[PDB]
Protein backbone atom coordinates (compact mmCIF):
# COMPACT_ATOMS: atom_id res chain seq x y z
CA UNK A 1 0.00 0.00 0.00
CA UNK A 2 0.55 4.17 -0.68
CA UNK A 3 2.12 5.15 2.88
CA UNK A 4 2.42 9.26 3.74
CA UNK A 5 3.77 11.50 6.41
CA UNK A 6 0.13 13.62 6.43
CA UNK A 7 -2.68 14.75 4.73
CA UNK A 8 -1.16 17.64 2.29
CA UNK A 9 1.23 14.10 1.34
CA UNK A 10 -2.05 11.94 0.43
CA UNK A 11 -3.18 15.21 -1.53
CA UNK A 12 -0.17 16.03 -3.69
CA UNK A 13 0.13 12.35 -4.15
CA UNK A 14 -3.82 11.95 -5.20
CA UNK A 15 -3.42 15.14 -7.32
CA UNK A 16 -0.52 14.14 -9.38
CA UNK A 17 -1.96 10.18 -9.63
CA UNK A 18 -5.02 12.10 -11.19
CA UNK A 19 -3.25 13.92 -13.65
CA UNK A 20 -1.39 10.62 -14.70
CA UNK A 21 2.06 10.60 -12.90
CA UNK A 22 3.50 6.92 -11.69
CA UNK A 23 3.12 5.90 -8.38
CA UNK A 24 6.19 5.93 -7.14
CA UNK A 25 6.89 8.92 -8.53
CA UNK A 26 4.01 10.91 -7.11
CA UNK A 27 4.81 9.20 -3.97
CA UNK A 28 8.56 10.40 -4.07
CA UNK A 29 7.55 13.86 -5.18
CA UNK A 30 4.79 13.91 -2.62
CA UNK A 31 7.08 12.78 0.36
CA UNK A 32 5.32 9.43 0.54
CA UNK A 33 6.50 5.68 0.03
CA UNK A 34 4.99 2.86 -1.68
CA UNK A 35 5.96 -1.04 0.00
CA UNK A 36 4.66 -4.35 -0.81
CA UNK A 37 5.08 -4.95 3.11
CA UNK A 38 1.28 -4.00 3.71
CA UNK A 39 2.27 -3.06 7.42
CA UNK A 40 4.26 0.55 7.55
CA UNK A 41 6.27 1.80 10.14
CA UNK A 42 5.20 4.45 13.09
CA UNK A 43 6.73 7.67 10.40
CA UNK A 44 3.55 7.31 7.28
CA UNK A 45 1.00 7.13 9.65
CA UNK A 46 -1.57 8.60 6.55
Same mark, same amino acid.
Given at each position: ?? /? /??? $????? &??? $? /??? @? ?6 ? @????? /?? &? &?? @?? $? ?7
Amino acid at each position: KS /C /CPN $TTGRN &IYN $T /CRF @AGGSRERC @AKLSG /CK &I &IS @AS $TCPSDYPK
